[PDB]
Symmetry: C5
Subunit: 311 residues, 5 copies
Amino acid sequence: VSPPPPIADEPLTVNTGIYLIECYSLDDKAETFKVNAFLSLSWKDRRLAFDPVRSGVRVKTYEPEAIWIPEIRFVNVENARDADVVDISVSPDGTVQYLERFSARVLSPLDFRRYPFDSQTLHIYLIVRSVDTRNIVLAVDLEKVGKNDDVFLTGWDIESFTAVVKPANFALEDRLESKLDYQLRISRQYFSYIPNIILPMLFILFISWTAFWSTSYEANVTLVVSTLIAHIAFNILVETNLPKTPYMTYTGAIIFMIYLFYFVAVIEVTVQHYLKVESQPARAASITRASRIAFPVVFLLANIILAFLFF
Amino acid sequence: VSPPPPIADEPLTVNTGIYLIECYSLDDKAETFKVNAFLSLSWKDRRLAFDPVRSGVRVKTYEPEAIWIPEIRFVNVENARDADVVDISVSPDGTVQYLERFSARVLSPLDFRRYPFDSQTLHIYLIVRSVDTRNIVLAVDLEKVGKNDDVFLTGWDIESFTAVVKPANFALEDRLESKLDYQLRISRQYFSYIPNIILPMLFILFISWTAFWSTSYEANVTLVVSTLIAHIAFNILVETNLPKTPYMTYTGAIIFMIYLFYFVAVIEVTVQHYLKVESQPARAASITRASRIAFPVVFLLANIILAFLFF
Amino acid sequence: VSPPPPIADEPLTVNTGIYLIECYSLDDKAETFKVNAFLSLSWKDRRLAFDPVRSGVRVKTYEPEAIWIPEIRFVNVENARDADVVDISVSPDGTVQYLERFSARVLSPLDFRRYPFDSQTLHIYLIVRSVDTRNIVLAVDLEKVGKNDDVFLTGWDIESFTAVVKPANFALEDRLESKLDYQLRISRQYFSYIPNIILPMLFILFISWTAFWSTSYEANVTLVVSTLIAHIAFNILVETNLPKTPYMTYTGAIIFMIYLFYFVAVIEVTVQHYLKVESQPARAASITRASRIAFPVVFLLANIILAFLFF
Amino acid sequence: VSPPPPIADEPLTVNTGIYLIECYSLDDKAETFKVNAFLSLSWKDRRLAFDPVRSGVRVKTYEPEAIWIPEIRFVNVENARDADVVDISVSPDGTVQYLERFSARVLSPLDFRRYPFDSQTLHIYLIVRSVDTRNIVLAVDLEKVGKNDDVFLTGWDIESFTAVVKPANFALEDRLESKLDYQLRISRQYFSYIPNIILPMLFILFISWTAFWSTSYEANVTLVVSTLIAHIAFNILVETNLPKTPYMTYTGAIIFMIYLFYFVAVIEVTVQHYLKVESQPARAASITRASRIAFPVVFLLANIILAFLFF
Amino acid sequence: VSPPPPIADEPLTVNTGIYLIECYSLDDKAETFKVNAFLSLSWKDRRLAFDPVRSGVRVKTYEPEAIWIPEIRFVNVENARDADVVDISVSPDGTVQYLERFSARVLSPLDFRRYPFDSQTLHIYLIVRSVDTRNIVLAVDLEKVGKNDDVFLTGWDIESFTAVVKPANFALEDRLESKLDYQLRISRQYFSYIPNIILPMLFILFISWTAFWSTSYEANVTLVVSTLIAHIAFNILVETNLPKTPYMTYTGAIIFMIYLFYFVAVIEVTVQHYLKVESQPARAASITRASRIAFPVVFLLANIILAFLFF
Ligand code: NI
Ligand code: NI
Ligand code: NI
Ligand code: NI
Ligand code: NI
């Protein structure tokens, strides 16, 4: 088999569509997601044209090996898609209608800068390589691009599944390549982060600040060091659900900043004890009373600055 | 091969049945379960009809490639099912009886709102796409729907395995689609959660309340902060076996609430110490004595409110 | 190909044997184990009978596709076995000798009630479904059931590999099914549990009891709360390599009970401090002296009761 | 099919090229990385030469089975590459242009000596074994060696992808072997290690040094022992993202050294208490004041020595 | 195809060789290792004899399907090897030279008794089953047994790769089997265990011994209990990289022994406090001074005894 011959000099247009059946395993660390979908393909092959009166059939069903089929591939997949041909139908004018159901593990970078209040645009790149006989170009039929209503991605809200209608045509290894960008827009369900991570982390930090209403150095050391220990258990838990980033994240910035608050609280507790031992308690009292206001105020202002820089 | 021709204009009815052989790996985090079952299919193909007197056989056995077989698929599967044809039998009137044994990893959402006292309805969606020649519709043969008595799902009680007899007929990519819903009802075995998670978590909380029978600030700080540390090691264990939900769960609500009790206990311990340093112990004594009753009472009432809202 | 015809009306007997080559990956959490073995099959097919003088051969070697072979399946496997046919030999009287080497992941429930002093009976269920032409029944040739001497299952002692000679014949979807039970008896090597889990867990508990020889409330709080923290680090470890059981395990019972001992020790430490603050030390001293005997005695008796209930 | 015959006695030159499409899963522990790329092959087969005037075609497209293709393998792969032939083009002189898209898991040792400020040279070894008819030699077509601009390896900067143009020709199992070395140079994005590991680890260490401004033995013991506990919860995190190295790593050296600082701090805290109990506080004061300068100074100088030895 | 006929009654000798290309993933817990190697086979098949003068050719090249090839298998593999035939060369006398490149996951038990100063003998068992026509026996061609110089097994030193030249011939399921033992001798690179596990574990133990230079019960309780807590984080980290054994390991013995030292240190700290409260400090002082010598001395002697028993 060889590609359909051009009537003039035009490229062969292969109309595409992806219909999502299942979306699962969005792996934040691996920056992958698994997909199960329908891939629809359509092109004109005049050599397959027939007369409906003479043949007695209005449509002709072929096996993939019997006819020419464009070699359509995905760019950003781990391995080639697991595909099963559902139907191949040829109309009298030779219009081929191809339908396959496939499953694939897709590589798609994630921007964690605004985590856990982030939105992502997952990509599925469709590609076709031109042949020596003729150039093959891809097109999107938007009416054949969609998703099942039941498509759910645990911990995410699915906004839209669309395609950038204009393909990216370029040369690769002395042959033209036609690339389509299918985009799955998702937004993170941040709800659970508030009672499970944000508030417990704030509670232990506020507990360390009770040392500003205590003159007992031994109890203060216990308060600040134990909550810092209680905080270490929380930081590690964050940096095992996310991959190693070259940039600063919203949550990473807050987590780092909270260490400074523990560090300055230890300095305050040390300074307070040192002055009282040095028979300067009136002074230690001024630093401790100022700390009661300074620590929550600086914490609030630093968080407003951070939220502003990130959002 | 082509589909059986209609006598009038009627759709081809494909009778289905699923008999569960094995149920395993209910993954709460992934919201998947693995299944090993028999899939039975039945339809009339008049082109395969025969005379029993002339043929000398009452039933004819065919290989899948020899005859037309409907392309039946599962909607909510990770990859296409691993299937092995067991038998194909044709009766004299042309009624085909197809039997295959398959294994599949099924995507089925779980509602954790009442965890660990939750019940679930797992779904297995059977689907068939109509062909150009004729429309294919699915039906349930209730006599061929069941499960092996030995079918066990570790940590769960299997209630029933039934099918919604009326299919969901709809258009998908300019063709008719007939969908059946097979439902596996299960209820969680909550027993082990009581001695392993609930009671140990309550023990450490009650230990923090012993600070209400102590005037020693340094020992009180040690009691409340250390048990809060012990509590942290328990929340992490629970959350890592469940996915991220946009709603509040029963266990998550209790776990969050217990933090407030640790936080208020620290305030009480701080207030008590502050008043005694300020030479107001009669007052500190009133707050501490009230706390002895308030903390268990508010804990009991808040749990009654939570149990009411969730059940 | 069709099944061998019956001389009278008798069912076709398929003699079976399983010879274990490798046993690996006994997964306690998943309740699975992997197996690599030989599966031998034997049956009489008179249509394959030949004269040795005329044919010039004493044995005939066939390809699986050339002759009729019974569809033998395993009941309790995750997916269908990975099998490779080794040999098919036909004797002059039509006796077929089939041999395949296979590998499979087997689902077999484990009873953890006596863990880590437990024994298990792993099962491999062989099954055959009858055909319309005739009924197929399975048989065990005990001389063809065995295991390689080098077969090792890490952390377990392999006792025996036998088969329940009488098959379980039953009707399933209007056809006879013949099921054989192959049993692999194993006993857990409990040795390492003594120095690695049991004794370290007992050491920290006995360390908490040193608080009964101390009047220092602050040191006592540190002793009991820190060892309870040390006990938490050991419980989590056990409840990860074990599934969520609807019943109570031997180790689970001991682990739960040890919490009560920590809880009562905290009450004692609190009661002791409260009485001394109330200028009643003679009384606190009586409770503390009684606790020195009561705690180890109640611990010993409760363990004797538990060992009796479980063994 | 047989290899192309030599015109004189020359070896057959197979021109190669690798174009990277995807780079993912650089597993530090396993010392592997996954690759998805184009493999281009080119050689002259005179038996396939044709006249463009007579044939009416300027290029001829063949199926892999129709013509002779060199058996090209990768040396350092876990299993054989998953390959799909994209195109086979023959020019009139018989120059074959072969193109396949493949995916493979590559074994490439990593040098962690300078971690997390390390750079690596990943290798992909191409190999061909000579046949009895003639010797096959590999060559690099630099114009067909490259990478997609979007090629990203999470946590790494991709510097270059080049090939050592001269093959390593050698005898292996009584036949000639021609080996090419494709090199992917990468440098680690160390940025995130500073706020997530380096600074938190330094904060807890500096917190232990506050004991040099305290005379309270009980608070000092709490400061140094608790931060050492906090440090233990950091060493474990690093040594589980790397394999077992026979040499010393930069990070491993720092982590080990920090233990000595905790150990000497405990000695100082013990010596200080011992002298004060022995009524020698003037002396304990001299050691404590010296420690305030000695500990940060020795820490800085030891880190300068380490940085010098490693970089 | 059928096996080569015997000239007299002798068994067919199949000469074997394994050449290691890659060694990776030595999994201590699973007791497996992955291998990528060349498997060479050689046997005489007189039916393939030819005259070099008449045929012109000195060697004949065949496709695997064209000639008879012995069914060679590996005993201790998880699944059947992934094999690709490289070459099949037939010499004038009928001597066949077969070469394949394979990859396999090998099951090989590991003796952890001397861990981390252990050496292992990994096994690769080659096997052939005799046929009805004649008996097949295996032999080792030592000239075809080896390994690539670049073969590296991370964390191990590769000593030798040899074969036990004499096969183990035995009857299995009424046929002869010929088994060869290929041995890969390796020794563990223990270096990193010293700064990463051994010394940090010793540091925390020595820190607990500072309690013998302190009269402060509350600081002593903090010293011994906190380092015991710091020790638990080091036993779990070790016993998760190794499987459960029925015997005792070197590292396991040391780890167990260190618990006794923590336990006796708590007794000493308790006895010291008890005597001082009982107005017997002269006696408490004698026990504490003796402990300063006894604890390091008994630790050294117990380690000498352990090293002697294990090495
Ligand atoms: Ni497929
Ligand atoms: Ni299958
Ligand atoms: Ni197989
Ligand atoms: Ni492929
Ligand atoms: Ni292969």
